[PDB]
Design a protein around this ligand. Sequence first.
Ligand SMILES: [Zn+2]
Lengths: 657, 314
Amino acid sequence: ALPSIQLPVDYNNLFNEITDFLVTFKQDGPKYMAMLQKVANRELNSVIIDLDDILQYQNEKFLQGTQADDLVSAIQQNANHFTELFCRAIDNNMPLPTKEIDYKDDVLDVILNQRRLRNERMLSDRTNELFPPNLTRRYFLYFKPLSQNCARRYRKKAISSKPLSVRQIKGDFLGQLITVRGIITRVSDVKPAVEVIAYTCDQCGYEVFQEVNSRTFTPLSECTSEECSQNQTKGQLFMSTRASKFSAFQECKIQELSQQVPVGHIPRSLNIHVNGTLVRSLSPGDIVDVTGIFLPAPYTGFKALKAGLLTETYLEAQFVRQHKKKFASFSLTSDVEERVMELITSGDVYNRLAKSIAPEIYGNLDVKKALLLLLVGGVDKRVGDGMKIRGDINVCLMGDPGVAKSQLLKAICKISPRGVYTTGKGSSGVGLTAAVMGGALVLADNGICCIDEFDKMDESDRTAIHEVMEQQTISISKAGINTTLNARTSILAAANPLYGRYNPRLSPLDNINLPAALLSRFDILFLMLDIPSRDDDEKLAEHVTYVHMHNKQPDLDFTPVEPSKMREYIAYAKTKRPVMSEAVNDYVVQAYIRLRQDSKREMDSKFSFGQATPRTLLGIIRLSQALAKLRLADMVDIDDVEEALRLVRVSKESLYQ
Amino acid sequence: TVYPLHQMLTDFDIRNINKLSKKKDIFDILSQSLAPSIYGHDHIKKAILLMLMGGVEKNLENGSHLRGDINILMVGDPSTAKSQLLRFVLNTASLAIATTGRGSSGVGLTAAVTTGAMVLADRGVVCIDEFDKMTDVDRVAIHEVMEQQTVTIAKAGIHTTLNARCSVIAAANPVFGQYDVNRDPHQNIALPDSLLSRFDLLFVVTDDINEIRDRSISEHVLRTHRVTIPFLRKYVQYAKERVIPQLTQEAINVIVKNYTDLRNDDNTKKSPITARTLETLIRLATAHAKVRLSKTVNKVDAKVAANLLRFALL
Ligand SMILES: [Zn+2]
């Protein structure tokens, strides 16, 4: 009748080892005293248990004796049992008072407080078997995976924590913690679950707590209480909702990333249950490594069909790590400034960073020179009434077929956070606008958006983008949408001149197919035209041969600035908000008259674009005010503005070559 | 059990390769090994090999990666075997998925299923038949696939950039009727513009007829109805993961001379030519290096790349 066979693993002394793991600690007073007391202090609920430290402890308990039984393998081997075992130990070592706990304060804590008060009183009076340990918690234990940088100890095969394919998943991983990855599907909305739910009786009272086990339970009436029982006759009892302990519950299915799908078959989703604090952490469409115990929840019946028992399972969520979590938000600027300073001290930050954007390609130091500004942006303005004036830079890159214009855009959208790369046919009109059930512009805003094949985008798209240079706007009046959403987006647009390539016998604006209503919005239009040159193309060929041949391009001598620290610098740049001095202002004005007059004295056709509409002025003030910020400024000196004019005139005027 | 029905190099095979690598003429034999049933087109076959190998892959430190693989297009009057060639591409290809015209939906996309090929074909050879017929809507995506080397899905939704690095072949009918042969260097292709560039090699084949060539067709066709080919893919895999030839200063000046020549003279002759062409030069050089099994790139290889890109152009 149900045979038994011993196993080398024993939970008795392992619990002891857990107790020695908790509250007795050194390496990080100890972390398990403070981390526990902050929960006891009731500002904190989630208890994040790292398996990394469990790994650290065994070293001290082995080599370095005295030797003990292993957990890290024994945990993930089971990992369900430890939630009811490893976590109950916390009850034995927890600080009792702990500090300033009171009663109300908290809702529902007063209920149980009065429960134990009336229970203590009435029991101590009667004597003149206790409320379950799971009802009194108000905290959740969550294990986390060991990737790990310190997993190299090495325990080798100990890691799962193996960011595995949904296909890789087997029936041999049930009851064993497994990380998985994929896109969130259907992300069902949160509903309360249940744990105890102690119903209330009537006549003689007391309480009884029915365990919520598996998926469901059967409700009971009768009477459990001996007093109401048999005399006279059976006391009636109802469930009290205030007394019950509720744990948030949210379920969501996750399909595979589809790159992990073979040449054949089909994407296979996996159902994932969420509890406690981790709730709402998950959002639809987001690739995430979700780790958790892998479990069945049978069967609810049916029960005829399978037969058997055919578990069908699900994944309990434990920890959540999402891919792709950001300036401008950081407080400090503590010793991180140090990480900025290696970049500052060398001086000539502007050229250095400039070159450091997309070094992967050769030439066009001007283009990059400006793209640095694009990434930086600022400063906008508020007129106090108020209305806004952007606020950011809008770049175009013209010319064809080669010159590798789009690689700069993969570059930027790689470097800048909140960057998004799209193409015309490509990203549909419904791609940029937001449906009711956004993308592109809304999806990427407060950061740079990137466009390719900017000609082929047809019409409805061009109206969106034509409008978004009023910034702060899209307006969708269609059907179920009256909203006006806010897009703070920056735009960079790579486009090809009218076929085939830039016919010089045609005037500008002829070989640029784009209307003048739109171009007035663009502050900087870089037209990249290609005329074969024997000297330079040698240098180029040397570059593109050198890499491939090597991966690292610059040598003898330059130091390419890593994108991470670079993003840090730019982050520290965006914080400044500089202001113009009187002298640079006047200079801007005078130079603007000279630029207007010289542009128009040129005459109609070819040359151009006119008219140098005020958006070019405001544009050059805004570029000025950008260049200032890499000086970190607040001064906004004359050489800044002059430099802005330089970038502007150099943009075009390359059509004379 | 489940035995399916319709790689392992053992001791001996790898030795056969090793012996065979030294011989100087092997490339031509190999290039002939593809076509038991198909005349001539030695240049095109050469191409398909050079796609099977494909210029290693190079991912720079903290920077974008340059495209390794080579993409090919074939344009000519029907009966050119263009649709016949591709199946034989498919068989020995080691992957990948075939796609014919429309085709789609999403082609390579995940479609973000509520509530594709190019991804599933990663590290492989995608075929495209009737490449012209395909809706522009898709082409817009193919731009992103080919050079950029990645696919991006913002759809609803799961928002991710997932990688499809596939190599690509396409066969596409001439614009209208048989007119391809005489018709201008442009207006003949029918699918402007950047696409024309994205493809590393644009090969044109003519069905124009001659009596001599005809006879020479006749006999082989006849005999058809009445060194091993399988050794070809085994020859290929070891070549692929072993070993990447890197790059050498033997060659560079050659491809630079060549490239500059192309731009300067051909921009008078024909079109299109850009930095893209240069990239392609390097990929071809490295691929032919793989064919040679050489741990290094060489000048001879450079000359070969030169040759095929010439027959592409002329
Ligand atoms: Zn009662």
